[PDB]
Design an enzyme around this catalytic site. Structure first.
Site, PDB file in Angstrom:
ATOM      1  N   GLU A  36     -49.852  73.280 -70.446  1.00 55.06           N
ATOM      2  CA  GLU A  36     -49.804  71.904 -70.933  1.00 55.06           C
ATOM      3  C   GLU A  36     -48.757  71.105 -70.164  1.00 55.06           C
ATOM      4  OE1 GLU A  36     -49.113  71.855 -75.210  1.00 55.06           O
ATOM      5  OE2 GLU A  36     -48.631  69.720 -75.157  1.00 55.06           O
ATOM      6  N   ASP A  64     -47.032  67.529 -70.561  1.00 56.42           N
ATOM      7  CA  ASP A  64     -46.851  66.355 -71.457  1.00 56.42           C
ATOM      8  C   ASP A  64     -46.323  65.205 -70.705  1.00 56.42           C
ATOM      9  OD1 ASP A  64     -47.673  67.876 -73.727  1.00 56.42           O
ATOM     10  OD2 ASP A  64     -45.625  68.541 -74.125  1.00 56.42           O
ATOM     11  N   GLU A  75     -44.742  61.905 -75.017  1.00 63.67           N
ATOM     12  CA  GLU A  75     -44.548  62.300 -76.437  1.00 63.67           C
ATOM     13  C   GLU A  75     -43.573  61.231 -76.929  1.00 63.67           C
ATOM     14  OE1 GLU A  75     -45.824  65.171 -78.023  1.00 63.67           O
ATOM     15  OE2 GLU A  75     -46.825  65.844 -76.105  1.00 63.67           O
ATOM     16  N   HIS A 121     -44.984  72.753 -69.609  1.00 64.67           N
ATOM     17  CA  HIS A 121     -45.171  73.977 -70.359  1.00 64.67           C
ATOM     18  C   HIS A 121     -46.076  74.964 -69.589  1.00 64.67           C
ATOM     19  CE1 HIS A 121     -43.942  72.430 -74.458  1.00 64.67           C
ATOM     20  NE2 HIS A 121     -44.408  71.290 -73.963  1.00 64.67           N
TER      21      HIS A 121
END
Length: 445
Positions: free
Chosen positions: A217, A219, A222, A233
């Site tokens: 993942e 991101d 956020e 991640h």
């Protein structure tokens, strides 16, 4: 999951721009699809629910394999996007409402994916040595809520090729995985995740089943109007992997750092990195979250080519025509980093006392292998039943001393973010993600 016959599946059109140089872009005619968790699940040859509230029907679903035979997921027609799910598109802007009180029920949160121009596969992005950019409005999201835009290593067809019992593929928003290895996904590897299903206390709409679904993942965003972060991640491996036991790295069994995914990730969060004045709701912050802005992300490789390894996630912003560079890490003895790199990850986690699971999972290089294979784009709005979003916008842990580096992530109170409260106070919250652009580095602004 089988597909039902009660409603046509109609994704929302959303054009994006694919660029070759500054101000020279072509429109790509993509569309948004709703994640299969939000779909009505009912008997394949009737009207009867297989899942209601936060429980599967134990007569229709005694086992996952029987569940999967007896049940199907159905489509979302245009009218329901707005009436039921609170999604709408205006030109090149997508809006997602947090709470939509429909005719006969109430929807809370949403997760959606970008489909390609055929509306048959997710639009996969190969992000290495590229720039991804979009305009955002988060002015109506306060403490406890998160409007998130991110990429995950889902399969382009939702898993249809690997899992014969998945009949919907990408067209029905199937195959979701992420670096949290979530057990709240209702359909995994083409089967209902109904074994040992448990409702979530205080969440009338979700539960957790026996398996989780892991994958890498990235991101990009956020955020709410108070705090924002971007985070890498990696996992070992990066691709969609159904997990059980220690491999999921479950928080509830003490296994957060024992699984296949880096759950914490390596984050750059301006406020946590000790610049409290950079981002916030007001004209005297550097970047004013009461107004829309552009978010630019550049994925730099070791050799400036598509073949090099990922080495650096760079970031800047544009607001009302003004270019705003990223904030920097601000702690005595630490270099003032303004991007995510392996070095930045090790220095900052060392300062914070955080386990460098990012490095254990292969670091920037491993994250980049995911990006090289291609990732799907996710747009979502949600609150947090496990930790009330305090990790994003308050002190975490809430009992920590906020002058200890790493604890303080935003100005919100440690009592904020309770889902039953935010679902009332912030019922009208809406995130907008628009004017998406993807191209070589330097091409999107």
């Amino acid at each position: 999951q089988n597909v039902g016959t009660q409603a046509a599946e109609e994704p929302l059109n959303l054009p994006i721009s694919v660029c070759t140089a500054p101000g020279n872009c072509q429109t790509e005619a993509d569309a948004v699809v709703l994640d299969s968790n939000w779909r009505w699940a009912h008997t394949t040859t009737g009207y009867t629910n297989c899942y209601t509230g936060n429980l599967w029907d134990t007569t229709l679903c005694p086992t996952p394999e029987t569940c999967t035979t007896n049940c199907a997921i159905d489509g979302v027609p245009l009218a329901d996007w707005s009436g039921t799910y609170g999604g709408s598109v205006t030109g090149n802007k997508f809006n997602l409402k947090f709470v939509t009180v429909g005719p006969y029920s109430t929807n809370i949160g949403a997760r959606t994916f970008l489909l390609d121009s055929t509306k048959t596969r997710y639009r996969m992005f190969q992000l290495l040595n590229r720039e991804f950019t979009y305009d955002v409005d988060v002015s109506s999201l306060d403490c406890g809520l998160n409007g998130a835009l991110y990429f995950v290593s889902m399969d382009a067809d939702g898993g249809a090729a690997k899992y014969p019992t998945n009949k919907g593929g990408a067209k029905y928003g199937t195959g979701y995985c992420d670096a949290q290895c979530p057990h709240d996904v209702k359909w995994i590897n083409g089967l209902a995740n109904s074994k040992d299903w448990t409702p979530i206390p205080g969440d009338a709409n979700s539960g957790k089943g026996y398996y989780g679904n892991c994958c890498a993942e990235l991101d990009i965003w956020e955020a709410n109007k108070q705090s924002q972060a971007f985070t890498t991640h990696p996992c070992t491996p990066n691709d969609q992997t159904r997990c059980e036991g220690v491999v999921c790295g479950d928080n509830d069994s003490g296994d957060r750092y024992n699984g296949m995914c880096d759950k914490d990730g390596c984050d750059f969060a301006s406020y946590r990195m000790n610049d409290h004045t950079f981002y916030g709701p007001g004209s005297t912050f550097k970047l004013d979250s009461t107004k829309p802005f552009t978010v630019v992300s550049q994925f730099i490789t070791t050799d400036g080519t598509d073949n090099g390894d990922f080495k650096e996630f760079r970031r800047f912003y544009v607001q009302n025509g003004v270019r705003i560079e990223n904030s920097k890490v601000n702690f005595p003895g630490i270099t003032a980093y303004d991007s995510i790199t392996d070095e930045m990850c090790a220095a900052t986690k060392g300062l914070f006392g955080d386990l460098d699971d990012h490095k254990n999972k292969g670091g920037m290089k491993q994250m980049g292998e995911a990006m090289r294979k291609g990732m799907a784009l996710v747009m979502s709005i949600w609150d947090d039943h496990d930790v009330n979003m305090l990790w994003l916008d308050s002190n975490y842990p809430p009992t920590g001393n906020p002058s200890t580096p790493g604890v303080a992530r935003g100005p919100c109170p440690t009592t904020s973010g309770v889902p039953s409260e935010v679902e009332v106070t912030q019922a009208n919250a809406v995130v907008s993600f628009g004017n998406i652009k993807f191209g070589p580095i330097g091409s999107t602004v």
